[PDB]
Structure formats: structure tokens, C-alpha cells
Symmetry: D3
Subunit: 265 residues, 6 copies
């Protein structure tokens, strides 16, 4: 249990809970939050027993810094090319994280917050969740990998309308579009994230990491490359203890350690 | 009309009907089914008069072998890398088949069965159809090209939730997501597959094969490559008899040989 | 204000209105329309003050030439490979146009017309709009980049069913599938296109063009390439006047010049 | 035979000779040359009897406009993004030209001239030929598709050293690196280009165009996509008269119409 | 030891020797050779103890069927699209073979023979070896994956000159271009192939197969995809016995089982 | 001037000199060297005045840890998948570094050292330089991005022979293959690296960084994507001071600040 400037981090039942802790400020994606998230990721890397992550906030907020923009308006192309790279190093790290990441969204996920939610493996939301890409309001292009991530979630035409309109997607529509897996009342959201995360603790870390890594590049790739990635990944999976444990159980007419997510209740 | 160990194959009105014939066992995707399907594909290749294929089962099943997994748990990486390749040779062959393939799903399409349904050009289902990727329950990564095929059907976020949750998609949701083209009552399903397949018999084999081949790689490719594929494909299509027959008919105020699928009734 | 053989072009409030003007003939995509559209694009390129384009028709039509096909049925592969390239030069130009293009569809968008609508950034439609790829009825493969564009809008399985069935998508389903952003009554359609287009006049031309160019290739590309494109694009955006104007306004508790699209009314 | 402001164009024995005609100015790649080259390309498109092109200059020059750069130094990102696109439209057209293009280089091919030579199918050079990418001397990135074309010719490491060093490659090294097919004395260069071009007149236009189009995208693509392009292209080639003529000749123990390039003499 | 119609197959010291046995006919790549090679590949798949393959011929020939072309000149696009696919199934199988393939070339490798040599992992040649792509002499595009394979070996410009010129590459130039690893006198060629093949018997089958599979797709892919393939492949390699055996040996100041190829002598 | 455990770092005339300082141990690529190199990269990022980097060693060595391998032989797939990712984070950072990196190689560059040299923009070597990929000797696949980097430098066939043979490339051959830009006597090597690095100090940081970023992804990409990257990059370059300074100088008949590398002497 560690309380940081921009988040609280707690490991309970092999689940790393990242609770962003500046709800009134809407947890802005600034250098301070980036640094705290990097600290979390480094702790996660060094500890295989942190099996699953939940990314969330105090209720009513998620993630949604103009002074730092103002101060750097004329800093020049070389500066901005590098500053974008700093942001992208973080997104790169999220996509490469070999643990499942569940985002629980109970407030605005705008700009950086929407990009952040797009790096999660599973997104759960309440009816309070709002998603928006509003960079064009600032005369800017979408950053933090949004140009890459959004079309892979919703297709080209939908990405275009979202980024040009800068409109807010509500939870129901985000669910309709497959950005959000399930919608729950605000008062029930954390428990659902808990149930799902704790179920994934029982899943094989190797199978999890390899499945995530392959899915994350699938739409960048081609048939033979993905077929070769499948072959290497399955070979790796079969050299772990989990398939035997699962197979023996099922042949003994018993349920395997990972049975999927718990039924909604 | 040939009755095999795992399927019955019948050609009627230029349509090859593949009826998997082990409903009680849920038509497991094993070496025996693979070999029988390969036999069918080889017969299809040698006979241009088998214009369309329907892949189906005795009602109540579709396609859904743990002993062979158990026996090979510690066979090693080299073995598994090769065994995955054997499976992938088959999927490669399905995707490369120059005839339209209609899958008619009236039962569970799980794991290999879901991958199999993903290789079809058109999927028809009843309310009994269930789709699931449950490899993670075994501590394994999805195989038979699922990592490649699923995101191309539903996008990255949806593929992720399906593969991590291992949940069952019902027919209605599969239709909503575009996996399934139409949902029909079990008692009406075969006749619809018949109507659709027999309509495609009238379509140009060259246009059909080239359209399928281009679509199958579209999302792996890029603008100039696909533009070049379009140019080569259309040049090839114009060197067949079908455009003349279709054009002459339409200019004579008559319907062309292929008018689309029959209206639902 | 210029009246051409196949369209009328009018610039009003920095919006270029392209009104195809052969409604009775359904504005066929022929050499004449291509040439007139090319003239428009060349005028747009030379005039940065034409900030947004609306592509539309006299009401009841959109875009939906068999004699030229008949006359060239046996012209040969070299001929057809080149003629396809001529068509594709135009589509290439549409996708590369650095201004937002709004299509307002109040009638059939068939074949070439559907391809044309797919090159727009935003599609608005009435309940009269119908979309269809019916090339297979002619024994031909889809042209004008449809094999490339359609799967990027709707995924592989949906593209396949649309192109094999040759069915007509109504406005409601096209909206459901994300081809169409909003559906409006025919009598209200033009005003909505007007409202949206005039709002985009306030958006930064640089941010607009760079966002469009990046989105248009996102699904052809990969993580590191798109990350590098993001970095270069943002560096370019920050060297324009619009971010300062937007940021100063927002820090002064005032709305920025571009606030998104006007609320539906 | 047409004499233009920046080139002379002559068709002799089905070969289109493009002779750039401002040797003292080193045939700068300006709006005037672009427009004249576009005129040539349009004439080539409309006339299938112009089977092969030779791109060359009065001896001692090839292709190697700072005032237009100076005048536009502060024109801004939107302007430059569009002006680059104008240049790239031309390069796109060169790469898409379905006729073989032979470049005969007897002088500096610098910047735009090097890019131009990279779009040719065959490059012949004299010992006077020099190749250089010197954009970095101007504080600029390489343009006219050089970032795309050069690594496909020489690999990444070599492209990097060339573009960072801005060094001049002589004919011998360019030949060593495969940029240049053959090196001939200045006094012999045109006749070799003539011999090679006239030999290609005998080659099948369809096979030529399809081979060029496939090669031009090969390194952008993947196994299954290129295999599908091969299949469509060969199907198209077999629907022409040339294979029969070639096969009949060879079975009659006679040489085919196209036997390759004439022996060096 | 099995003597077939088009080749003799012999396994000696864990090396599968494929000796094509129709030298006078230049071992034409016909249905008969394809079928015999497929038989070999199937035997190789079923026997992990066949660790390395050598593909060769009786001396003076390698691999270089016009009647079957003549008979099918007007068979049509659908036919040819399928026949090309049959050929490509074979090439696909060669590239996917998880054993190292050494080609020993002591004669013409023309057309199909050049494509065949391009699928090998290592090519050894004598001064008698000649390589040529001469499809354009027949009015055809290069087949058997040449459009894909050649640019990956030599770059775009070189592939173009080779395919347009249809010239013969001698051993020395092929070695210069990296097609050929080593050139040996005809009388010494087989022994060198023997030495190299028997050395690879000591290499880890898993590392071999995974390295080959990754290299074969590297130029089709991108940074993050290849990084993910590396991670999965190394994880798989570390679950084999060979690293321990190699590491223990080297730490004991002893040579590992695989030390590279024997010195030339 | 900072002396670290595995390297000394010195900034002289805007050039960051990285001098690896464990020559007797051959500067092994271990956690300690990685951490020190990361420290350097972080200092480079924070200081735009460190314009160019030289990566080198005390003479006689470059970069060429079995105990850490031995200790982790059976740590499992999940562990190794993550440890490979740690290594790849570093390589990713090298490729993304917006400053030119010159490697000066005066000794063995083996395994990790060869991968490291492949991330440099320019490689200079002495006749003492040796390059080798010898992972297969350990029963392992090449790591640190070698599977990605090597084919982009030398093509597929050459990468294969290098990785399967595990042979040592001498300086002369590495230069022949374009891995090495220039070969200099050991006693002259550092001064050449100095001359080249100090010349690049005069080059535009924006043009440098954008050119590097585009080249690094060129072979992963496609025509339209690279054309769009070119457009965005040039727009960014024109918003810097360097083009004006260079253009004004050249129009004044004076040399620009960056004239290329100094002549060899």
C-alpha cells in the first residue's frame, strides 16, 4: 500500500489497484501522473505476483495542463517531436505490459484519458463515463497514440467522425461500439472490476501475456506473420504448468482453475 | 454422395454440402475431421462444377480431443511448433479456397469451431448457435488462426474481451457484431443456406474467387498494393464470359444471371 | 459559382458545395463527372479559403454507363489495367485531399457512388439513402478502391457479406454500422450538412489535414510508424497560429474558435 | 515530335524519348519540368503504341529552384504539406506508369533528380553520373519519395549513410549498389539505351505492366498478399495473345519475340 | 533410401539428401517433381530425426513443360488463378519447413528453379550455376513467389533489372549479390554441402525452426510485431535442453555442440 | 565528464562521447551496461545541446554474461518473455533517439554488440572489427531486435546465412555489405569519428531527427504512409530557422552551415 502524489497503489489478492487520487482536478495526464504510473509499472514488472491491474479513480472522475502547453507554444518542432516521444514511451509501455489491465471508468475519459482507456484490455464503465477526443478544439492532432488505437477499436469512419466532431460518447454508445465491455451503476462498478480481476488471477500468466501481445499487433500484421507468432506462442504456453493442471481437472470432470468471468449479479 | 468417418459430402445443384456427422460428440476438430475436410477440399479443387460450399452439421451441433493434448503436454516446443503449423495449413487452405463457403451454424462453435466459422464467407445461424474462444481456460493461446481472424471481424477491443472472458456469444449478439449475417429458426436454417448457395451458383467463378482473395488480405495490406490488386483482378474478370452475359441482359431490360440472394420468406 | 455539365460548384462561407446536377440519370460516375470533380479538386487545391467541402446532389439522388462497358468488353487486360488506374487516380486524390469532405446522401449510393461516399470524412444521410456494392451482378470485382475502403469501415466479415450478397443497406443500418454519422429527414439534410461544414471552417487547416492523412493510413500501418507520424504531425501543428488562439481563449474562460459540431435541433 | 519548354519528346520505333533540354541549368526539377513531364505521361497513357520510355538529357547533365524555396520559407505547415503532396502526385504517377522506363544518366542526378532516377525500371549511366541526396544541407528532409524509395534500393544502413553524409555516389559505386544496371562511356550511352528500349518493345505490355506493378509494392507487402497478386496477374497475362505467340515459336524451335536485351557490344 | 520418378531421397547422418534425378531433362518443375517433393516434405514432417535437408541434382543440372502451357493457353482466368495457387501451396510449404534447407546448385536454376533456390536457407553453387528469371520471354509474369522472394534477397532495383532483362546471373555475381553463400568447384560442391549440413545436425531444432520462421517474415513485418515474435520465440527456445548443454559446455571451457560451419578446406 | 561503472561519458564540442570502459571483459552487454547507457540516453534527452553521439570503446574492443543465463535456464516462459522485453525497451530507445549516433568499432561486435551497432546511424570500423550473430551456438534465437534489424541492413538471404553459420564478418566484408560506412586503421579511427560527428553538429536537429525516424520505419511501411510521413515531416522542417540560414548562404554564393562530412585525409 503506497500513497503517491497522483495515485494510490494497493495490491490485494494478487490484483494491483491503481486509484488515481485527484478527482477534483479530473486526474490530469501530466508529468506527475506519468511518473507515478511509471513507478507502478516498474513495481509490476519486478513482481510476478501482481497478476492483474485495475486502473481507476475516486468515483465521478477518470482522466480528463494548458499552462504547460501555453508556456511551450513556440518551443519549436524539435522540442515537440521529443515531447510527443516521451508521451509515446508511456503508451508503448502500457501496450507491452504482460499483465491484463482492467480500466474502470466512472467519469470523463477525455483526450489522454481516452487514449489511456484504449490501452486497457477490458473497459468497464458506469453511465457517468464519457469518452471524447477533443484535440481539434486546440488546433492540434490527437496524441498519445490515439491515431493508432482508435481505428483499431472502431474502424476508420467512426474514428474520423469522433475526432472531427470532438463529440462525447456516452457509456451506452461506447458499449455499443465495443470500447466498453459492460456498463454498471456507479455504486456497483468497483465490485464488478474486483470480480473480473480476481478471476483472471487464476489464468496462466504466460498464456495471458502472449495472447495480449499477439492481439495488440494482429491488425498491424499479416497472415503468415501471425501464424508464425501463434506457433511460437503456443510452443511457449505448452512449456508451463497451467495446461496440465487445467487438462487433468477437466478430464477428472472438475472445473479448471480459470472458468471465465463470474456471472453478472 | 460420399459418407466419410466425420462428415457426409453431397453435391446437389452445383453446391457441395459438407454435413459433419458426429453430432453427439459435437464434431470435434481432430485429425480425423481435418483429413476428411482436406479430402473434400481436394475434390472441390479438381471440380470447377462444385461452385459453392455449405459447411454444416446434423442439427443441434456445429463444431465444439483433450486426451491427445494430455498425451503431448511435455512433447516440447519443436513438436508443438510443428503441430500448430499442421493446423494452420488447413486454415490457410480454407482462406485460399476460391469458392464461396457458407457456414450454417445450429449449435456450439467453440475454439476450433469458431475459427472454422471465421474462415467462411457467409455465416448463417439459428438461436441455438453459440460462439466462444475458451483456450485461456486451458492455459493456452487461441489457435487455428483465431489471433489473426477475430480482430479482423470485430476489432481489437472486442477480440480482447472475447478471448480474455472466454464468454459465449449468442446468435443475436454475433449478428449484431457482424460475425453472423442472418439468424433463422433451427427448422428453417438449412433451406436458407440452400437458397443463398444456389443463388451464388449463378455468380461468376472468376469474380467470386478474386473478390474473396482480395477481401481476405485487404486488412493486411495498404492503399497502393490493394489498388494494384484491384487492377490485376478486374483485368482478369473482363477476360471471362460472365460480364458480357450480364451486361447484354441488363441492356435488354432483363435481369442478369446473378441478382443477389433471394428475399427472406 | 460555376455550373458544369455534371455538377454545380458554389463557395459560400468558406464551404465548397458540390451539387451533382443530373438527378434523373442518378449522377452516373462517368468520364464527365470524373473530369468535373477533378476541376473542383484543382480549384480547391489552389484556394486555401475553400476550407470544407460538401458533396451532394439534387434531392432524391446521390450517385448510382453500361454502354461504355459493353463497347470495351473485349478490349483486353492491358486496357482494363490502365482504365482501373484512371479511376483509382481519382480515389487516391479524394483520400489525399487535405480538406474535410462531408457527403450528404439523399438517394442511392451504388457501386462507384458507395466508393465515393467511403472517401468522405463524414457521411450524413436521409432515410432515402441506400448503399450497395453490386459489381458481382455484372461478373466483376468491386472497383474504385472498394476492396480497400469497405473492410476498413466495417471489418472483413461485413464487407464480404455486402459484396457477395450485393444487398442494399438502408440509412438506419448504415448508421448502425458507422458508415453514416447521422440520419436526418430529406427536408432537413442540407441544413445539417451546412451547420456541420460551417463549424469546421473554424478548425485549424493544418490539424485537420494532418489528422485526416494519419487516420487514412492508420489501419495500413503499425505502432512505431504511426507513433512517428504522430510526432511529426504534432510538431507541424504547433507551428501554426491556431493552438495559441485556442489556448489563450480557454485560459481566459472563453470558448475556442472550434467547439465541435452544433447541437442537433 | 514535340519541343517543350523543359524537354523534347520524340516517339521512334515505339519508344518515347524524353530528352530534358536545359542542360546549362542542369534541368532543375521545377513546376515547369513537372508540367511538361505530366503532359508526356498523359500522351503515353492515351497511346498504347508508346511501349517504352527513355528519360534522359542533353549529354553532361541529368537533373540537379532556391528562389521559390526562399519566397516560401515562412508560408507555413498547411502550405508545405500541400506542396509536398503536389510533388508526390508526380512520383506516384511515375511508379504507376505501366510502361518500362529507362533512365540514361550522363550527369548529376541530385535531390529530385536522384528521386526521379529511383522511379525508373532500369538505370543506365556513364562515368559522369553522380548521385546525391543533399537535402540535409538545406536543413530539410529528403522529398519526392526518397525516404520510401532509397531504402528499397539499398537497404536501411546505406540509405542512412547516403542521406546523413549527403555524399556523391559515382557511377561505379552506384552500379556496385544496384542503383545502376550498366555503366557505359558517355559517347556510347544513348545507343545502349536505344538497344535496350527497342528490345522491350517486343515484350508483352500486360506482362510488363503487371510485373512492374507487383515489384513496386513487393517490399511493402507480405506473403499471402503477394501470392494473391501473383495469381490475379498471371490469370490476366494468360488472357493475352503474347504467351501463345511465344510458346508456339519456342516449340517450333524458333526464338520468341522477346529474347532479353541485346548482348553488349 | 527411396528412388522416385523425379528424385532420389536418402537419409544419411540425420541429413535428408534430395537428389533430383532427371539431369538430361534439366529436372523440369512439373506436377511429377512437385508430387515427389511433397512426399519428401511429408516424410520430413513425420520424422524429427531428419534434421537438415540438402536439395541438389546429378551434377551439371539443377532445375530448369511448355506442352502443358500450350494445352492450357485458353483455359481461362479461373483455371489459371487456381493452378497458380497449387504452385504457391508448394512454395508456402518450403518457406514453412522448420528444418534448414541447403541448396547445392551445379547447373541452371531457371524460372521455377530460381524460385526453388530462393526458398532455401543456404545456397551453395559451382561456377556452372546460372540463375535467370525469364518469364517475360513467354509473355508471362514471374511465378512461384518470385515477385515476393527476389526483392527480399536483392532489393527492388535489382529484382527489376533481373526480371525485365531476363539475363543469366553467373555464380560469382550471385555470390556478390548474396543469393549464393559460397562458390566451390563442381567436383568439391557436394562435400561442402555435406560438411555444412552435418554441422547443422548439432544445432537446436527449436532455435533453428524459430529463427527461420522469424527471418522469413521479418521484411513483411514491423518493429513491435517482430519484437513480440522475438519474445515468444526466445521463451520457447529456453524450454528446450540445448541451451543448458551449450552453456554448461562453454562454462566448462569446452566447445558447444554447434560451433558453426567447418572451416573451408 | 562522468565516469560510470561500464562507460565514461564526455561532451566535447556538442558531441556526446560514450566510451565503454571494460575492454578486458569485452564490454559485455549486461544489466550494468544497460543501466549506464539508459542514464546517458536520459541526459541526452534533457539536453538539446548534445547534438551527436559517438558510441565506442577503449581500442581493441567494442561489445562482445553466461552465469546469468545459467542461473535462469529453467526460470520459465513468462520470465523470459519479460526479460526479452526489458532488452527490447533499450533497443526501442536507441532507434527512437532523435540524435545521430556514430558507432566506432575497433574490436568484436558479437551478439548484443552487433545488435547495438545495427541501431547506429553510421558505423565506422577498423580492420580489427568483427561482427557475428552466434546465438545458435547457445541453442537460442537472435535477440535484441537482430531478427528485425539484420534483414533491413543486408536482405533476407544474407541475414539467414549469417545467423545460421554464426560466422565472423570482417571489416572489409561488413563495408562491402553496407553495415560499415568506412574502414580506417585503428590508430586513425577515433579522429574520423570526431570529424564526422563534429560536422553533424552543424546539421539541423529537426531535419536530422525526422529523417532518422522516417528511415527507421521506411521498410516496415508502404507508399501512401511514407508519403504522408514525408509531408508532415517537411512541414515541420520548414518551421525551423535552419532552412533560411542555409538558403540565404547559398544564394549569397557562400557554403551552408552543413556541407556534408569532411574529405578523408
Amino acid at each position: 500500500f503506497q500513497s503517491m502524489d497522483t495515485l494510490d497503489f494497493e495490491v490485494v489478492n494478487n490484483v494491483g489497484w491503481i486509484r488515481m487520487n485527484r478527482a477534483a482536478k479530473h486526474n490530469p495526464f501530466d508529468a506527475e501522473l506519468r511518473a507515478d504510473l511509471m513507478t507502478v509499472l516498474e513495481r509490476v514488472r519486478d513482481d510476478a505476483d501482481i497478476r492483474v491491474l485495475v486502473l481507476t479513480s475516486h468515483p465521478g472522475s477518470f482522466c480528463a495542463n494548458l499552462h504547460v502547453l501555453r508556456d511551450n507554444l513556440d518551443s519549436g518542432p524539435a522540442y515537440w517531436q521529443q515531447r510527443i516521444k516521451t508521451g509515446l514511451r508511456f503508451i508503448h509501455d502500457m501496450l507491452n505490459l504482460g499483465r491484463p489491465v482492467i480500466a474502470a471508468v466512472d467519469g470523463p475519459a477525455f483526450g489522454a484519458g481516452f487514449a489511456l482507456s484504449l490501452t486497457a484490455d477490458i473497459v468497464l464503465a458506469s453511465p457517468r463515463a464519457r469518452f471524447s477526443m477533443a484535440y481539434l478544439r486546440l488546433g492540434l492532432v490527437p496524441d498519445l497514440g490515439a491515431l493508432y488505437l482508435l481505428p483499431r477499436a472502431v474502424g476508420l469512419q467512426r474514428a474520423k467522425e469522433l475526432m472531427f466532431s470532438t463529440r462525447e460518447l456516452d457509456a451506452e454508445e461506447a458499449h455499443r461500439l465495443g470500447l466498453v465491455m459492460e456498463v454498471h451503476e456507479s455504486e456497483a462498478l468497483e465490485q464488478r472490476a474486483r470480480e473480473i480481476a480476481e478471476s483472471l488471477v487464476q489464468a496462466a500468466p504466460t498464456a495471458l501475456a502472449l495472447t495480449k501481445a499477439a492481439l495488440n499487433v494482429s491488425l498491424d500484421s499479416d497472415e503468415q506473420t501471425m501464424f508464425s507468432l501463434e506457433a511460437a506462442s503456443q510452443a511457449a504456453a505448452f512449456s508451463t504448468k497451467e495446461p496440465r493442471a487445467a487438462i487433468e481437472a477437466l478430464l477428472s470432470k472438475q472445473p479448471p482453475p480459470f472458468r471465465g468471468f463470474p456471472r453478472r449479479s
